[PDB]
Amino acid sequence: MRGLSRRVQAMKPLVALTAGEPDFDTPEHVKEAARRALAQGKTKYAPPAGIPELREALAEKFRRENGLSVTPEETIVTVGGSQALFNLFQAILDPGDEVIVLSPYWVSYPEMVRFAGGVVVEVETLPEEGFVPDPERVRRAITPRTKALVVNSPNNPTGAVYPKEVLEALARLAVEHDFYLVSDEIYEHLLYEGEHFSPGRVAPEHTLTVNGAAKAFAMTGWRIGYACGPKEVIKAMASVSRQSTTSPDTIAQWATLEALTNQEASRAFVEMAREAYRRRRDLLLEGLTALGLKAVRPSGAFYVLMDTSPIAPDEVRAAERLLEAGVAVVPGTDFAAFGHVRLSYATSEENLRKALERFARVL
Amino acid sequence: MRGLSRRVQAMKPLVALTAGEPDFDTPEHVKEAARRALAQGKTKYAPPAGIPELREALAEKFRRENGLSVTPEETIVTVGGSQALFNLFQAILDPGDEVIVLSPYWVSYPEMVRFAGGVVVEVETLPEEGFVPDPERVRRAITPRTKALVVNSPNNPTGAVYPKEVLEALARLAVEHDFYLVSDEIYEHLLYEGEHFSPGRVAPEHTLTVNGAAKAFAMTGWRIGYACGPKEVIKAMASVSRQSTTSPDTIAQWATLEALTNQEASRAFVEMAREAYRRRRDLLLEGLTALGLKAVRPSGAFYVLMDTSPIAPDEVRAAERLLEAGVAVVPGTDFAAFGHVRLSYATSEENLRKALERFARVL
Ligand SMILES: *Cc1c(COP(=O)(O)O)cnc(C)c1O
Ligand SMILES: *Cc1c(COP(=O)(O)O)cnc(C)c1O
């Protein structure tokens, strides 16, 4: 023994509506590609930035679906979208550098930022404003130390989808003040209304687009993510991978290739899931409204932030009360969504009905 | 844009005998377990420290095969042995802390150490001493800033196997001076003569044992590693995983479980590979001797460090000459094995014969 490092010591330590992954299993066409890979002996080390075939397909995906002008060399395959974010912050942050985070935010953002020595500068997003950021508020938080701004749309945990105008405004601030715009787009296919716009169309040399197969193809356990952006940053990210994970699982990389190239089979899965989620969202929202429980209507992902005022004075107490009632929910504390609890509708309509029933018994 | 971080900027940028992975494909019993996992829908997120079933099997493995007294909670599954090492250094090193590394060393050790802010203190290992460390030399490099000492046996790239007495001496220094002993044991099953001793038997609260399925079961592309040691360090390591990779591939975790529980099928693979490697080693060594090329006889792994004095004045030039001759070798520069080139015998005997033929044409 000797002692743990400071960075590690500074880290923050029934019907369930807490899921952060699809209830659907990964589509058969992807499972098949994995089986073929095993049979073909695709079990050796892959390059740090990923199997070239995948990087090629990734360039086509970002260009075709997102309108991004990228080359295969400006693409990288990682161990989940989480490692894409982690490697990114390790590659661009020096201790002291600031990163603007829009609250409510995904729990992991501030963790990853601080682990690299960065300073988290939180900019609040309001319920009454539909949880869409106000570029003016963001403009006020910019300082000479600002290294990056994190944008996540469709958003976790709000479910909000930022309109193109806002995304363009934020991209302009990055160019204007010379910093990186980190765009987390993993929920792009879980969109019920509106359109998914990619900021990188506007500021390609400032934007690092993070995505992955996780939520879109029900591949959370496969651990395959991807990102694109300025070649020098992508290269730096591959360097961090070389010294940590070496490269993602080779079998999972070949399976993901199938998910991207077999557009027909994947499209069918995406449409099926989206329609299923939409039904669940509507069902949930109607029930909450009927009970007089406030919640901003989500347009993407499979989350809903519910105001817990009528349940208890704070999210923690509210989460406990609902637990007593037989409903597991995620308190919004760690998301900086105080007075709110996060509901996930990636479960059966039956479970959603049972939860609503319980909610009523609590009121 | 804005700029890359200092830590990333400070990173160091035909018959082939350069392989760092087995030429054998992963055994069918492991492939089967993976297929069953897919069929059973084991595709969701796993806990950060790994699937509990695997951690249980890991405790049995370290205890049964290595004589280590560990509990499942003092076990962790990572994305390759490389991430085990990476997370470890991120969890115990503060900028300035020193880490003793025995040269020749595996290229990645100093990279990972510096990335965490540590200082690499290199202690030389001599050819004439069979590349086995001298505890006295190691004792001289210890300072009040020493945080850890890295030991790798069987060794990459030397192939040396350290005798129990030496391992015990090094473990004693760690207790005596109060620092961590990092023992990289991934090549334990690729042993031709002698016995594999685990330092952790002597100093359990000072030793972090790193291992993995990579070289032993020809699973380099599956990316599954594991380690055991002091509960607080293991816990810290799981925390780094939570904020980076989340958890290793779920399918690969279930496949690895089979490799550890089906001792019969795995033992058979290990014995087959070991016998194949032994033959190749002997063949290679005889040929080198016949040509008058010096090389310390390896007892483990599948590497051989060859003295390039008769080929050229330095490894780089020697590597180039051999390349012209149609033989790809790894120059020992990055291993701190100057005047030497690293040969890998994880190929067919035919390719080894062809390489020897070429070597002759060069002399
Ligand atoms: C799922 C998710 C990610 C990345 O997930 P991986 O499972 O690691 O691919 C990143 N951000 C948010 C908001 C997510 O929901
Ligand atoms: C293979 C190896 C490792 C770890 O490899 P993984 O493929 O990441 O499990 C660590 N040290 C040495 C010397 C190795 O040869």
UniProtKB/Swiss-Prot annotation, chains A, B:
Changing K12G: 10-fold increase in Km for prephenate. Does not affect Km for oxaloacetate. Its cofactor is pyridoxal 5'-phosphate. GO terms for cellular component: cytoplasm. PROSITE patterns: AA_TRANSFER_CLASS_1. Its main location: cytoplasm. GO terms for biological process: amino acid metabolic process; biosynthetic process. InterPro entries: Aminotransferase_I/II_large, AspAT/PAT-like, NHTrfase_class1_PyrdxlP-BS, PyrdxlP-dep_Trfase, PyrdxlP-dep_Trfase_major, PyrdxlP-dep_Trfase_small. L-aspartate binds at G20, W106, N156, R342. Its EC number is 2.6.1.1, 2.6.1.78. The keyword Transferase applies. The keyword Cell inner membrane does not apply. It catalyses: L-aspartate + 2-oxoglutarate = oxaloacetate + L-glutamate; L-arogenate + oxaloacetate = prephenate + L-aspartate. GO terms for molecular function: aspartate-prephenate aminotransferase activity; L-aspartate:2-oxoglutarate aminotransferase activity; pyridoxal phosphate binding. The record marks K12 as: Important for prephenate aminotransferase activity. Homodimer. Catalyzes the reversible conversion of aspartate and 2-oxoglutarate to glutamate and oxaloacetate. Can also transaminate prephenate in the presence of aspartate. This is Aspartate/prephenate aminotransferase. The gene is aspC.
